[PDB]
Amino acid sequence: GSMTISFKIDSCLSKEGNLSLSAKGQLALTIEDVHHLPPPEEEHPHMN
Amino acid sequence: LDVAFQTVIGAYSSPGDRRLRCLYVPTHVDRITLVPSLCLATAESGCEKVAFNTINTYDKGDYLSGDIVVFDAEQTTLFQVENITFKPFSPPDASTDHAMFARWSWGPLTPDSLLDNPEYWATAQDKEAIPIIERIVYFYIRSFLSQLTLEERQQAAFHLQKQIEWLEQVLASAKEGRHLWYDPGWENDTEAQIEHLCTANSYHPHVRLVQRVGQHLLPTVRSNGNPFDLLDHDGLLTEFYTNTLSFGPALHYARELVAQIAHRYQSMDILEIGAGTGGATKYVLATPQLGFNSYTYTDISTGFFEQAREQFAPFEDRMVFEPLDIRRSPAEQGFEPHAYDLIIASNVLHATPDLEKTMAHARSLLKPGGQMVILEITHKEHTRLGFIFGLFADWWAGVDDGRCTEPFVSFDRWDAILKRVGFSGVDSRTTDRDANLFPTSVFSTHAIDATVEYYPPLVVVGGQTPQSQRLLNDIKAIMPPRPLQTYKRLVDLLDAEELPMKSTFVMLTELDEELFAGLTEETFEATKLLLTYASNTVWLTENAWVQHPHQASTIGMLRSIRREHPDLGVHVLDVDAVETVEQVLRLEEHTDELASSTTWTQEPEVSWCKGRPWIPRLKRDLARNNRMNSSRRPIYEMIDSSRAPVALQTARDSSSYFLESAETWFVPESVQQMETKTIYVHFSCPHALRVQALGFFYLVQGHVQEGNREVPVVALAERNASIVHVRPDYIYTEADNNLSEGGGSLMVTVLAAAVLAETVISVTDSILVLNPPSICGQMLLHAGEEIGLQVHLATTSSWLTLHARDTDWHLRRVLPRGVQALVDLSADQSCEGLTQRMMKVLMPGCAHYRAADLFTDTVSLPAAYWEHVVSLARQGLPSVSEGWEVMPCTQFAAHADKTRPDLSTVISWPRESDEATLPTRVRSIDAETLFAADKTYLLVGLTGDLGRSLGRWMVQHGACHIVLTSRNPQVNPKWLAHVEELGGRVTVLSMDVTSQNSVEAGLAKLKDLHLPPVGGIAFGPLVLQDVMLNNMELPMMEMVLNPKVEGVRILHEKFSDPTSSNPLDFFVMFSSIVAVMGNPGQANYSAANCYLQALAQQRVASGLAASTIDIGAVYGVGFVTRAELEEDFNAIRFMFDSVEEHELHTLFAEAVVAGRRAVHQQEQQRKFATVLDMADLELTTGIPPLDPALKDRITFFDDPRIGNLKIPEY
Amino acid sequence: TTSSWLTLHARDTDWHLRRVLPRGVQALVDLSADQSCEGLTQRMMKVLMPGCAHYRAADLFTDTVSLPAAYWEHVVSLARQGLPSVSEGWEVM
């Protein structure tokens, strides 16, 4: 039920330049053949 | 999602606060996590509006770290974020620094008439330097005199005096000139004697130049060669100017004089003539934070300017370069006439035969009253400087004046000429009692004009006290013929039938019963009447800031009045002892003087201390500014690690190691952590070693001071610092030389690691240790033998010589099958894979311990422990030498790598100040714990957002018991629960500090709650009435004062005992920056805050911890936020800078540290007798860089108090 | 538990763990059969005491194998403290 995917958004601002790395990371997908996250904190009490 | 990210910034920074001083862009997101089903459901639902929460987990400034949680209306989390790291688009620079912090630099109201610093006297060696070369010549000096002058004519007439233009007469007369000193039997042997001086200090450059020029003056004597280029490219003449302890002390006095002048007159237009290479420029301009509005670097030749542009780049923003020929009119040269506040002639007036005309030119460029600072030759002495001086190509240009060279003008003749050319005469001089300062003795003068008058009606109020009576009589006798009125009391003034409305008032009331002690007697309406009838006024106070807080409340009220009524000249004179005259008349006549376009300044607030007048000026306290900004960028300060705790700290990302300030800033908890010994570390282990599951400790070795004995010891520190504070339980006190320098630390570190490995596992019958240090291998074998545990050694370099990338089958073949635990000490991570394979071949469930489990860069005991450690170490000390892997802390920080730990390496901490004075990465004031867990910290009036934030920060920094107080303490109990989660019990007291009964009831309830004794107070109760004094009412005065004034009075009386078992670690009184500068409509507030300041000052003078923080506009929290005044204060931001919630926490932290430091210095007999000694107590804050472009809007820009805080103008 | 028990949740932030997790813990025993909690466990190692002992489910439960009487005596004694917690055929297959 898992899928690990290394992802890299390479970027090139102008066709003159080479392709560079804009972003990178990993993706962990909990999947199925077709409350998953902690409930948020208690709406922090006093906030200007 | 980008808006969700913006939520992190919002948590980090409030609108209008500017805590986001640089553009942070998301650089590294640790973990996003999205529920696609819920996100799609929300998108298709049509609500398209979801709630969010966000924590600004990291906010120090270098990069923000935040965790986000976005959820639906039903509170289901659509997606969350964890440690999203926004890093600045570009690394933060000093231009992004927050300059809110400032200190009351207390400096003289006028430069000292005689610069006589003992540190800059002619030291004994100098008083042996020059007198030795005198001894060479003293025999027949009286006969040499005229001859010497002839020798000094080598530029003008020496080549004609004895037909010395002919080389025969050259070889004759040049050697005869040298023999005018070498004649008495020394002759050429003096060349050796000269060298005998050059070998050491205080005589090197001068006599070395004597040698170097005398040996080559022959071509120059005939006026052919260059007098000083005879030594290539000014070999030592610059050294003679800069380093000689006869020339040098004059330059030190010049720096002192320039510092005093620029302090008293800020934003001076400075023009240095004769700067040349800039040695004098370096000396004078090196003064820290001197008020130069524009520094016109200047010399007769432009050739030096490039060098200046290289030497004075930091001042280039204020510095401009232009050449000036002092022999020529400056206006003809482009310099604006009378456009300079100060001029500095650096030993160049002797290079012009037009001395009088050059000084007249200097006057032409100086504004009326401008300050001329002259370093120049005076009071010639033949036996001391003949050789080098007699050569130069224009120093003798000036004999036309009548005497030898441009005469060695005596300070008396200097005064005569200087007065003739339109100045005030010799106002200041340098101590020239004995010798060695006559060639460079410095003088200070004013560009005299209509100037001070050492007419409007004068009214004196006060004189009731016998000292006040004496001062009133002295005023009457000394005042010039003027219309006069006199009133015993200000109430009598209110009863006065007739008063002049253009009156100049001299108020001795504060010497008598203060206004703020008796405002209920209509003294406040009398003050209104005084303001109405007053155009100028001077108040006299008797040590208001240190002994009479009511007088200081008056000072604050008048400080705000000076802003409310700018046409009303307001002056205050604080006298530490009234009995110690003649200056109040001077200040009154100064107030009558309103020369706005001239250098002379108003002197809004003077203080008479130690028999001299002084003034305060707000100067950016670069120490605490650097401390605050180090939280946001790598701020470096020159710190002495030998005497100041300096920790070799790993980077946050563990990128590398760097030296940082480890100052604990006087945390008073040393009782439960009993007898915390201070170890001055000579050698240490870079990596912290785990110790029997107690934690990670850095193995350190070094001195401990026991009766001045520097006893060597080895301990388990927790900071890896040059100086550590560690409990004795973690110290091995024996001074065993076998545990040699560095080597002993290495062995004890190795055995700490080995004992950890043996203990955390011991249960097993056999273990394997992978790639341990050879020393570590031997000591692990010894420990296993002693504990009866079969230890096997494997090395990837007897040892089981494995290899990285070895196959699992090979490991099965070779690795013993009896192993039950694996201890991977391989610093290199390459072996990691091998280690994994071991877990496949070794016993199932085999215990695993990596190098990170025994060695680490982060830390955040039975005597038998170190006894066994040293015993095992003694089994294998001879295995290696003492300096096996010794490297200095600087070298390690420069070249070490956290990812590549070098186990069995030892940092050698420098011990000499010269060796240890290094650029250390400053640490934030609140980076470390600042508060004790066994004390209650009482935040009075701090129940609002500001106070609650301060309390949560306190508990985050060691405050386990906090008491918020307020007449209406509206705080959610769940907020108390939240702060409890932080590790501190917080309670609300419902204490109205206005009443003694209420305060006593609250303090008794503290005991009823069984809270620890009050160890500190954060006094910040506030009531505001934005109204003018003329329109203000006494009830408003009481309303704003009593919460402040009476509150501090009650709390001080409750905690005024320094002998009590629980003295306050700090008494921080939350003052407003208006207390330091005033503010229209808030004289009430400023007077209350000034009462707070004076109570803090006199409480420190009483031996009790105290301090004040002159806060600006707190946007994130406080009344500015709940009242939604952010826009109003932003509209006047140029007047009051924004103080963030966390920057306010930093300011309070530094105030606490200042109070503790003041107490400790009092233990070091610091008296804090006068206001000049308590600038550190008052942390001035909230004043932005004052832009001259906004001078019109800034209602206090004309106040010299803020002079150092002004931005370049051109 | 990621399902008294400290009802944590998988994918919880390290800051939340610092807020909730007790600071006196010296060892961590991850018995989560589902590997989803693994990441959470890693975050615990960042918030818990440095050098905190770690034990995963593989360290206490495994599918491969390749004693004092007091041992089983204590085991059965402790079991007898909580036998009624569930029925006999709780997860019989």
Ligand SMILES: NC(=O)c1ccc[n+]([C@@H]2O[C@H](COP(=O)([O-])OP(=O)(O)OC[C@H]3O[C@@H](n4cnc5c(N)ncnc54)[C@H](OP(=O)(O)O)[C@@H]3O)[C@@H](O)[C@H]2O)c1
């Ligand atoms: N512009 C500035 O310079 C500036 C800006 C912000 C803060 N500060 C400083 O920081 C401190 C806190 O400011 P703040 O924004 O948080 O103001 P605040 O919100 O009004 O908090 C102060 C509280 O202390 C309470 N209080 C406690 N004992 C009192 C008494 N005996 N009489 C009257 N009120 C009493 C006040 O009334 P309640 O009990 O009902 O709450 C007030 O709510 C101030 O004292 C000030 O020195 C200065």
